Amino acid sequence: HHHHHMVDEILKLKKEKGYIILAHNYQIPELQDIADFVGDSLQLARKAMELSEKKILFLGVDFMAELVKILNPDKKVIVPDRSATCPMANRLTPEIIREYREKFPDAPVVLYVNSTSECKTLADVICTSANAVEVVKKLDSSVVIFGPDRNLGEYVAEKTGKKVITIPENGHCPVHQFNAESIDAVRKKYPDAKVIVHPECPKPVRDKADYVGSTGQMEKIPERDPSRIFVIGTEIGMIHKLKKKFPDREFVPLEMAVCVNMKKNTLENTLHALQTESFEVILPKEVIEKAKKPILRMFELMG
Ligand code: SF4
Numbered sequence: 001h002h003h004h005h006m007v008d009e010i011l012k013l014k015k016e017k018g019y020i021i022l023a024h025n026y027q028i029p030e031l032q033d034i035a036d037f038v039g040d041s042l043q044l045a046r047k048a049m050e051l052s053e054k055k056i057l058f059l060g061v062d063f064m065a066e067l068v069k070i071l072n073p074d075k076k077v078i079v080p081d082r083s084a085t086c087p088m089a090n091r092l093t094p095e096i097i098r099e100y101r102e103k104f105p106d107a108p109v110v111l112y113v114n115s116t117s118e119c120k121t122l123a124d125v126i127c128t129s130a131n132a133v134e135v136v137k138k139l140d141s142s143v144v145i146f147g148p149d150r151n152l153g154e155y156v157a158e159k160t161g162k163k164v165i166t167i168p169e170n171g172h173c174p175v176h177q178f179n180a181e182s183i184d185a186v187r188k189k190y191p192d193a194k195v196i197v198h199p200e201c202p203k204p205v206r207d208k209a210d211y212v213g214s215t216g217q218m219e220k221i222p223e224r225d226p227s228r229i230f231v232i233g234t235e236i237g238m239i240h241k242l243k244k245k246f247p248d249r250e251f252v253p254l255e256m257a258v259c260v261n262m263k264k265n266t267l268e269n270t271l272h273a274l275q276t277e278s279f280e281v282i283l284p285k286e287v288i289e290k291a292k293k294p295i296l297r298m299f300e301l302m303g
């Protein structure tokens with residue numbers, strides 16, 4: 001670290017004001033280092049239920065911050081940049097959900113966490129990339145509506161054998177659109193490397209990988225796989241996380257992939273957030289009341 005002033009002041013204010021700092025795995029290394037907890041969306045959702053502080057500084061994108069607020073309606077949740085969002089999530093609308101419910105009335109609506117809070121009020125259950133398979137398996141229906149990510153939906157259909165109707169038309173994460181050629185090239189360069197990719201990746205990339213999982217799942221792979229070299233097909237922030245957790249291994253990006261929205265949070269605007277205790281996540285009471293149900297069901301159907 002080479003920003004000792006910013007770091008020391010962030011720590012001072014966090015302590016003075018009674019904040020816990022939660023971060024997603026795609027946040028810059030300097031922010032992961034000052035965070036009290038870093039993880040994927042499922043790990044963040046569980047932490048949001050368990051934590052005991054009354055004030056939360058959240059470092060990620062808006063849908064995630066809103067989930068934390070939904071689970072903690074009487075706590076203060078702040079974010080440094082209110083424009084930090086997921087472009088994929090924003091393409092699915094209430095109107096598309098109602099259209100598909102009318103077409104396939106027997107199918108439960110399973111929404112990825114990457115979805116607007118208004119859309120969550122219209123979901124039967126929420127999932128993350130780590131538990132989507134388990135959640136869909138547990139439901140009675142042989143058919144489900146799934147969105148907004150077509151790739152994760154298709155992965156779920158493969159693993160569960162259920163019919164998955166994806167919405168909207170070609171909803172997808174641009175960050176995870178790697179080329180399968182990139183895997184061919186690393187197999188030639190590193191013949192006993194293992195390739196780990198996200199389920200948001202396209203089918204040809206998933207199929208050529210050794211492992212497919214959420215970032216939380218990726219972090220567990222070196223606990224069971226002794227490979228000297230791992231090649232990682234996700235957003236670049238996870239490669240730092242992995243290097244720090246397993247300094248004895250080599251982690252190589254499959255390609256450079258950056259989520260510009262995840263990178264909106266900086267040391268500078270994080271300090272400003274603590275100085276001013278802004279920007280608070282504010283949601284209407286009715287949204288909190290209606291969206292909590294599919295979120296709590298995710299955990300209820302896990303175990
Ligand atoms: S990496 Fe993709 S799915 Fe994740 S927040 Fe960024 S745009 Fe959304």
Ligand SMILES: [Mg+2]
Pocket residue numbers: 105106107108
């Ligand atoms: Mg129905």
